[PDB]
Design a protein around this ligand. Sequence first.
Ligand code: 1LC
Ligand code: NA
Length: 307
Amino acid sequence: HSIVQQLHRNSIQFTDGYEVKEDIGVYSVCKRCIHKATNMEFAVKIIDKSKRDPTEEIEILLRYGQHPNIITLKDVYDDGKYVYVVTELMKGGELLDKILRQKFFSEREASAVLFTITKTVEYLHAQGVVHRDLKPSNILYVDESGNPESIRICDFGFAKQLRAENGLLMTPCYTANFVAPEVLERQGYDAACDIWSLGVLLYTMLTGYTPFANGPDDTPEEILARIGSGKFSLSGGYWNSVSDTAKDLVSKMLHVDPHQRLTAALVLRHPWIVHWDQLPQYQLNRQDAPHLVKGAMAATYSALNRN
Ligand SMILES: *[C@@H](c1cccc(C(=O)c2c[nH]c3ncccc23)c1)[C@H](C#N)C(N)=O
Ligand code: NA
């Protein structure tokens, strides 16, 4: 029965030092705001306490915000009814959106982008944290520098830390403590779902289209059907100028069975991430239809989270 501190109705009000502006994103309420003191751009996430408890997420942001590739928390408030998670704004747009519009995008470049991301996911996992919503629309650029250092994993709304039955936070390594079985199980599947979403990312980065969807009109049943089959083509036209190490890595990360699927750690050991200096550099023969992909991607996760 320790104190949280995250439960705080202090004096200063959020809208007392911040000026709200237009909306942002596309299931969590977000808006752009300005610091009424330094006039700097910030992103704020408003949450209804009556509809959800954000304590879990807020803490994850605090203890793991320092990570360069994790959206940084800059401030937070609680007016009693809502909670104002003030983080840094993303002016670089969605990472996938930008990359899919770069005709001269190579594997060596795509391999660097994924390396940076997985490196972040590995750390999170190592500290007993899973995202459980690691879709491409939640991976963005902080600025338009174009470099991987400006990559940010965002929206830890559905994130969950690992802890024993009594409440102690433990890492996937430390086992001495007593943790519920189904919990240790769910924490294993969740960590696999993240890697799978990264497989969806790499897939789209290479080809130019979504693996389990063609457009925003595909029926939920046919998509889930493709997802349940564990079958995906890697010998199409767009798959001609693609190395086998890529095709291989892409099949491993997307392995239908979670157990046989690679973990963040293993992914980083794959020769496609390790021997990146061997990878090709000539532009990838891809499909140019980022808007359609954005529709297909949304249709995919829409069916997934249908339940
Ligand atoms: C909402 C949310 C919260 C905090 C910051 C952002 C953000 O910076 C952002 C995401 N997509 C954007 N596109 C253009 C400008 C800024 C963008 C967004 C929600 C959560 N959590 C989310 N989409 O991440
Ligand atoms: Na950060």
